[PDB]
UniProtKB/Swiss-Prot annotation, chain D:
The gene is LAP. Belongs to the peptidase M17 family. This is Leucine aminopeptidase. It is found in: Cytoplasm. Aminopeptidase which preferentially cleaves leucine residues from the N-terminus of peptides. Also, has some activity towards tryptophan and methionine and to a lesser extent towards phenylalanine. Has very low activity or no activity towards the other amino acids. In addition, cleaves the Cys-Gly dipeptide, probably as part of the glutathione regulation pathway; cleavage only occurs in the presence of Mn(2+). It comes from the Eukaryota. Homohexamer composed of dimer of trimers. Both the identity and concentration of metal ions available dictate the extent to which oligomerization occurs; Mn(2+) and Co(2+) induces oligomerization, whereas Mg(2+) has no effect, and Zn(2+) causes irreversible protein aggregation in vitro.
Length: 516, 519, 511, 48
């Protein structure tokens, strides 16, 4: 519980914003058939033109204002085009002789927008909200979206709109003002209304994960991160247990304990539990890699391009799991028991650190020869997986920023999924489709298993170049007889262009728990 | 014995050591080939060659005391097989007693005199026939010419290569692991070879013991656990021992050695074992081994590609060779000699407490040293161990160390390099290399490079600004710590680890024992 | 013969200085017993102090000048110290009121000077010569030196004093030497002058950049040398090399604008031939590395004009042998000269090439080109029916890591020949150390497709693996290989050493 | 030959062979000395 400090200026908690300005937005959903009232703030039409590439803007909705309807006639709109992400602002007087701001965002010429296309639409709409002091936004849907894509639109809007100012002191944005109202006009509105509060919950899970990831390693360390998980569990009425060093030694978690040896912060194993009232039909363990800082250890991240400055993000897996705990704890699914696990520690250089070549014993008795101290994630996960399997669950899903090779294989958009069970892999792929968090199935190639044969220990930690596959083969040795999947988010977790985390995996894991 | 510090309760507090190995349970019988070969249980292998005729036919020359086996092994039956070095074949037949017998051969090529490298290939082929076959007995028939030393090398190599180290196996022990209980040997003039049997068994264990310490990872084998293992060995052999701790090392002003260990959680431990013959002492020798339990490189971290930081548990190979030699000497009990077995044991780590590049440190002989690179730590620990050794008033000081990576580029993985200040001592090491069959090559200490160690501030620089002749410059640095004693330095950085087999060699045990014994 | 040019400004020959100012120095050797005369120029005493830190300078020799003797008194000289290479020299008037300069060079406290120590003494002497307009230098030996070390002193003095101004766009006329048992040392003088020129000649070829010194201009220079010395000569061109099936050597030169030229000079002694020798020098006029380009930091591509140092040592030896005319020996001076370049025409990594003895070679790295040219030169040398084959080459960068910049490495298939080379090293004062050919590493040269690999994958022990490759091209002759990659270039002085000339001449002469 | 379940289990030959010498060599007692570890092999020369 007490966070150790070197100096009195060292922070002792992660600052967390729970009540965000997004939570103060009053959202109203109206059916487009009753017409659009254009009364204040800014009214944006989401418009496309199927077939006609960069075709003209045509506003189909009925507008309940003679002045605004005239302004938006085809003859006036034809000078503007639908090119994906294009936007324009209009200014006019409505019937009540009041100034009104209207505009549109171009949704291109393809009838079905992908998650990537929808993100471009949201980003354009967000540029219209930034640097403009507005009390209200109204969005008119003149494009076709299913329930999942409408929810993705709102989640993405809320997430992108939100600005994280926890670490700003003298440089806070003096002109930061958030809308207080959001109006939505859509066809068959009654079917979309249930998506609003689901989107708000999904946004917060994602944003909460993002806050933990963005929090630097001096703020977010094993002690403060496990304290934050306890506070979250208390707010959601989830059962919780934090395992300290003495309990971890009794459980013989030698692989996980060796990684944390060189840290000033004691290892903290997070175990949160959600249990449905009623008959439990499915038991799930969600395991997130929780390295608060990855220096690489004695195999120091010193090579050019090793991205040591980004290593505060090495607890992204744990953050996705905690964000999922927020969503599950809030939405309260029936017939399920979910265990939210993370073997939290920090990988440092010290007289006390584990060394390359060390032989360590995992909690299942397997001896491991450490070939590289920077392949620490798989060691912490090995003991977390043994712990998860002892819970007697139906599925074990781990999520981790495990291998840099993901950037070369799938890049920054798609996470990789590996596993020992096809039905579980398919459930993750289906959750990927409904959450709109892209994942691609990658193989666990058994032919590479012989590269992990150690001359001295039972197994090698590393091979001695298909790194992400070899890491999955190593993890597979710690799951004996349970359906298991591993999601490598090393490439997708950080948004390099926006210089911020994505909170990747929260929605994917929640959809997985909810749709089961 | 000292208490090994732990970070977590799961950290090991001793090095596991196997003293009673399955090799020690093998009953060896040597028979003269003139009385004929009896072919019964187990596997009987003929070591055959064909001088001149490259890949020539197999011909069995020995009289075999079985009509059925003799018939099977006739020239007409054997001519389809050839002697190509390392080739082998298995035979199955019924003998005169209607019992199934397994026979075979290992090809020894076409060169009458086998080198140590050729003999190793023959032994490896023989070992492949022992692995994956549950045998109670092996019989070896020598139809090749081997001198006494090569015959002993054959047995040592067989024992060493056959032995499988399972100390770190838990869930992956080899379920089919079964060793022979008997070893039969047929050779011409057998009575002359008999004395080599028990000498080979001692040499095998000294080598295997060194190998066990080297293979033991740095969390198991640290300065405290390694000095504790040396105490246990000394107690078992009735050798005198003294382990110098930090307080004693500070009193002795061992600043170069102490600076290296500053960044470690393990206190420095200086090993001093002594063997003294019961009668008149005619020769006094100090054997000094480099004892770095883990070499991270320190602040000059081994971060460069190919710097092999994952292999650095082997940086105490010199200390391991010295302790393996103490086992052989303590067991064989040579007369008229006093041997000191020394190692300045420590760990080279990164910490707020570590020594830094540029630090000026004072050795026990008062020489100030400017540290140019924290990864040239071996020569610093050796400087203080050499000052200590010379104060013992010995006739020879021999050091053995995994000192310079450049050895891999100069001599490679088979031959160690020897440097020294005395030609007679170098020649004794070269002679010990020949009789132990552990190859060594004499390299020069080039005096012209000495000026590269001139420091602007300190009395001497630890390293040259480079120069690049690293192994020679390291020898010039060491030479400054021996004032008036015959001294030799064996750089084993290239030879200590068997990269292909992924295991240590235990290099230097037999070389140092032959040196002590033949003096 | 005609050197190809890209532009009309490209040079078509290597400028060579044969008549140097060193050749104009009149040398006189005197016994120290009769006292030293100080009448003109500079007089230097070579002084040591057995039992020093270094200790004070004390002059033992009697000097036949009252003014000079007063300057050289113990009280004055005690203000100076004997530290190796330390010097002081003063201008004053002698008894005849003439300007004379008198000084010393510190020789340390060790009675026996090494070749390295003597070089430091010489360098200090040369610094005084370069910054003083003198007509005469007199050296007084108050140290003990043998005949070979005395000759080394003279050669080193002449070599270091000489300044190469061929690419740029005064010297003493007399040398006096005072030494104990002066009659014993006299014959060393003209031998030193010959040894100096062979070394300096080798140095001129090495220092000559790759645009000046290319395969055509270097073979033309070898013909001119042969003509001046009355040596027999033969230059083998591409057509002849193709007929001889020299595929390993020809592959290396494929990417060059300069046709390959194989140099074959021959010295025949008067009298019955007691030994026939072939001296083979690596002759790469420029080594870019080919497709395995020298692009790595520290690969020293800018120094690669020195890659014909082996050929230069062999030609320098031909000068000494041709001048000194030893008896009962026939010598063949060989070099497979070419340039290793990047072109659409170059050989590639992976290419399989056929050597002149029919062995197929798989090229693992285009920058291990020396061994390919040497393989064909060794096959050629063995066909001559010689007693010894000695090759000299700037073969492997690993020599810098093993022996460094002072000692060359010698490898071979015959112990008697190796011992003759080490002995020649001792008498020439060009240091060499015997390194092994480890047979266990031969299996690393087993190729999946060709008869042999050019290189080992990893190598580990690169210089040894290169020697194992070369050994495959000598079937039944005593052979030695001298790797001079580390010793050829003097990095501190930014010039070649001309290493190997004196070593090879002493080898031929003492046989 | 394999041995389902029994990891690195003994070699056991099921086929009947039409040679008395070879059938004797192939008996369970002789074959159990060897194991099924993937890629492991043993072969012997004999008279049929
Ligand atoms: Zn890492
Ligand atoms: Zn990591
Ligand atoms: Zn080191
Ligand atoms: Zn070391
Ligand atoms: Zn090259
Ligand atoms: Zn070259």
């Amino acid at each position: 519980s007490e966070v150790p400090q070197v100096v009195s200026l060292d922070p002792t908690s992660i600052p967390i914003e729970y009540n965000t300005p997004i939570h103060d937005i009053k959202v109203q959903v109206y059916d487009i058939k009753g017409g659009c009232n254009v009364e204040e703030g800014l009214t944006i039409f989401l418009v496309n033109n199927p077939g006609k590439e960069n075709g003209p803007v045509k506003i189909s909705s009925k507008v309940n204002d003679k002045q605004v309807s005239e302004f938006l006639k085809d003859e006036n709109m034809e000078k503007f085009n639908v090119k994906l992400g294009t936007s324009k602002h209009f200014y006019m007087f409505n019937d009540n002789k009041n100034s009104v701001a209207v505009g549109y965002v171009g949704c291109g010429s393809v009838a079905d927008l992908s998650e990537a296309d929808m993100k471009r639409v949201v980003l354009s709409l967000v540029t219209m909200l930034h640097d403009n002091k507005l009390s209200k936004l109204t969005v008119v849907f003149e494009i076709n979206v299913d329930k999942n894509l409408f929810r993705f639109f709102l989640e993405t809007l809320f997430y992108e709109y939100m600005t994280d100012e926890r670490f700003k002191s003298t440089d806070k944005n003096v002109n930061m003002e958030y809308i207080k109202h959001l109006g939505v006009y859509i066809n068959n509105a009654d079917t979309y209304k249930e998506e609003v509060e689901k989107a708000r919950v999904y946004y917060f899970g994602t944003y909460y994960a993002s806050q933990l990831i963005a929090a630097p390693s001096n703020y977010c360390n094993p002690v403060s991160l496990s304290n934050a998980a306890v506070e979250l569990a208390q707010k959601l009425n989830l059962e919780y247990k934090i395992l300290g060093v003495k309990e971890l030694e009794e459980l013989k978690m030698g692989a996980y304990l060796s990684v944390g040896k060189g840290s000033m912060y004691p290892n903290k194993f997070i175990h949160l539990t959600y249990k449905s009232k009623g008959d439990v039909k499915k038991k799930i363990a969600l395991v997130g890699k929780g390295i608060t800082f990855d220096s690489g250890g004695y195999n120091l991240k010193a090579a050019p391009g090793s991205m040591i400055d980004l290593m505060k993000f090495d607890m992204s897996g744990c953050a996705a799991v905690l964000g999922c705990a927020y969503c599950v704890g809030t939405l309260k699914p029936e017939n399920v028991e979910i265990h939210f696990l993370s073997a939290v520690c920090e990988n440092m250089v010290s007289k006390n650190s584990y060394r390359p070549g060390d032989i360590i014993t995992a909690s299942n008795g397997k001896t491991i020869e450490v070939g590289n101290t920077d392949a620490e994630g798989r060691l912490t996960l090995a003991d977390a997986l043994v712990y998860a399997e002892k819970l007697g669950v139906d599925y074990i899903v781990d999520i981790a920023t495990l291998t840099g090779a993901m950037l070369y294989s799938l890049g920054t958009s798609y996470a990789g999924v590996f596993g020992n069970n096809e039905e579980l892999i398919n459930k993750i792929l289906q959750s990927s489709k409904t959450s709109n968090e892209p994942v691609w199935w990658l193989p666990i190639i058994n032919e590479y298993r012989a590269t992990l044969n150690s001359k001295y220990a039972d197994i090698n930690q590393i091979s001695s170049k298909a790194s992400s596959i070899v890491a999955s083969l190593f993890l597979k040795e710690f799951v004996q007889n349970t359906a298991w999947a591993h999601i490598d988010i090393a490439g997708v977790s950080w948004n390099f262009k926006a210089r911020k985390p994505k909170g990747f995996g929260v929605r994917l894991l929640t959809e997985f728990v909810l749709n089961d």
